[PDB]
Design a protein around this ligand. Structure first.
Ligand SMILES: CCCCCCCCCCCCCC(=O)SCCNC(=O)CCNC(=O)[C@H](O)C(C)(C)COP(=O)(O)OP(=O)(O)OC[C@H]1O[C@@H](n2cnc3c(N)ncnc32)[C@H](O)[C@@H]1OP(=O)(O)O
Ligand SMILES: Cc1nn(C)c(C)c1NS(=O)(=O)c1c(Cl)cc(-c2ccnc(N3CCNCC3)c2)cc1Cl
Ligand SMILES: [Cl-]
Ligand SMILES: [Cl-]
Ligand SMILES: [Cl-]
Ligand SMILES: [Mg+2]
Length: 382
């Protein structure tokens, strides 16, 4: 296999075993001041997401042209407020919300973003960016527009003095630093079967299936309650200590913890365990991301909850996640998704998650290190 674009990049070769931790290439000390050229009739436009009209155009581009499953049944449907949460965390920069418009119509047809993140990779901590929401309009696909978007965001990140990035993708590219698998816990099995998310699996009836996936009506962990403002510091402390066991993690300031965890309805939920002493000892979190269901006369949207960061010090992990399922169910979710990273393997089978189709590969740009098992990945991106 060759990669006409990826082969020119500072990433390791697929198939080479890596034994040397460090940058692929030295930092560039002068950077190109001019944007890379797009094809004729298209232009750059940095997108002001504080503008309601412009945020809606981005919502529409992603709603119509972002990630689908291999059979074109489901497409992510990130909401405008969720996009604002994802794309404006602390340290966000306007030039890192990189759009492509058609010159004549103004139509938004491409996007890529970067947000700043401190990343701990093995024994190094490095200021990086996280690249997300790369999207080319379906009518514009396969015209090598994706490499221009990647090069242009790279140049704009370089201008800010940053030379490493982290990203995930569904496809295998040079070269995954780790490979995760999605698993799903049914919460409304009837809808999931009706919309062909899952199959009636041999040999159980529908009635057996609903019974199998039935959950308690309220969580069982004593003192579980939503996170509040007073909890920001101890959620920050617990998260920092907990992550030290993994090899790829974020290093978040207290302000980033407030942004990523403080509850926002229909975007992010976090529940803490406040014990009999008033001490918060654990927390669970999950974010809300629906997917459009296409070509179906009755069901239009599948409501999914996604496991975020789950920190146990005193409640067993297995119990926290069981309460996470119960809460997702009570909130009206159809499915709970989680990856096999961190210590998630310890609960996935027990709590009746089924394996799904498709990997999520983790990558670093301009950094070589050995790859790691999923159990060592402790970074979750939206
Ligand atoms: C210092 C800072 C550095 C900053 C940069 C860090 C790097 C970040 C890299 C990006 C991190 C993104 C993280 C996310 O957001 S992952 C989510 C990706 N987005 C979607 O899946 C939405 C649906 N698909 C699309 O919108 C288009 O198919 C996209 C835009 C994905 C490709 O558009 P198109 O289909 O019109 O293709 P093309 O003709 O323009 O180009 C074909 C070339 O592009 C390579 N390709 C295909 N898919 C991906 C992919 N997901 N990551 C990286 N490369 C990908 C492909 O191998 C080929 O290269 P090569 O095989 O010839 O070599
Ligand atoms: C319900 C549903 N809706 N759609 C849209 C799909 C594909 C499913 N089935 S899934 O649940 O099992 C699932 C899910 Cl959620 C996601 C991915 C995946 C693939 C490629 N890229 C990403 N990114 C997400 C994180 N950062 C940007 C890249 C995710 C694959 C699968 Cl297969
Ligand atoms: Cl190319
Ligand atoms: Cl099911
Ligand atoms: Cl390796
Ligand atoms: Mg293209």
């Amino acid at each position: 296999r060759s990669y006409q674009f990826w082969d020119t990049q500072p990433v390791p070769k697929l198939g080479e075993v890596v034994n040397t931790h460090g940058p692929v290439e030295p930092d560039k000390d002068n950077i190109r001041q001019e944007p890379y050229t797009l094809p004729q009739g298209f232009t750059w436009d940095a997108l002001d997401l504080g503008d309601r009209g412009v945020l809606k155009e981005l919502y529409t581009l992603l709603n119509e042209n972002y990630v689908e499953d291999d059979d074109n049944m489901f497409r992510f449907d990130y909401s405008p407020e969720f996009l604002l949460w994802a794309l404006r965390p602390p340290g966000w920069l306007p030039q890192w919300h990189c759009g492509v418009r058609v010159v004549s119509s103004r139509k938004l047809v491409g996007f890529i973003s970067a947000i700043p993140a401190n990343i701990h990779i093995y024994d190094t901590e490095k200021k990086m960016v996280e690249i997300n929401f790369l999207c080319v309009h379906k009518k514009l696909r396969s015209k090598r527009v994706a490499p221009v978007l990647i090069r242009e965001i790279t140049r704009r990140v370089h201008l800010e003095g940053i030379f490493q990035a982290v990203y995930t993708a569904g496809v295998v590219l040079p070269k995954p630093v780790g490979t995760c698998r999605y698993w799903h816990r049914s919460l409304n099995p009837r809808k999931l079967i009706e919309v062909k998310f899952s199959h009636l699996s041999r040999n159980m009836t529908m009635q057996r299936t609903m019974k199998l996936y039935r959950l308690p009506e309220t969580p069982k962990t004593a003192g579980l309650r939503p996170m509040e403002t007073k909890d920001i510091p101890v959620v920050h402390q617990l998260l920092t200590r907990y992550l030290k066991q993994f090899h790829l993690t974020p290093v978040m300031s207290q302000e980033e913890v407030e942004h990523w965890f403080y509850p926002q309805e229909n975007i992010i939920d976090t529940f803490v365990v406040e014990n009999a002493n008033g001490e918060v000892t654990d927390f669970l979190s999950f974010y809300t991301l629906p997917s459009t269901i296409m070509n179906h006369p009755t069901h239009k949207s599948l409501k999914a909850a996604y496991s975020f960061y789950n920190v146990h010090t005193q409640t067993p992990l297995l119990d926290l996640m069981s309460d996470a399922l119960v809460l997702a169910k009570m909130k009206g979710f159809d499915v709970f998704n989680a990856l096999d990273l961190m210590e998630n393997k310890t609960f996935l089978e027990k709590l009746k998650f089924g394996i799904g189709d498709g990997n999520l590969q983790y990558y670093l740009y301009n950094w070589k290190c050995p790859s790691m098992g999923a159990e060592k990945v402790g970074l979750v991106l939206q």
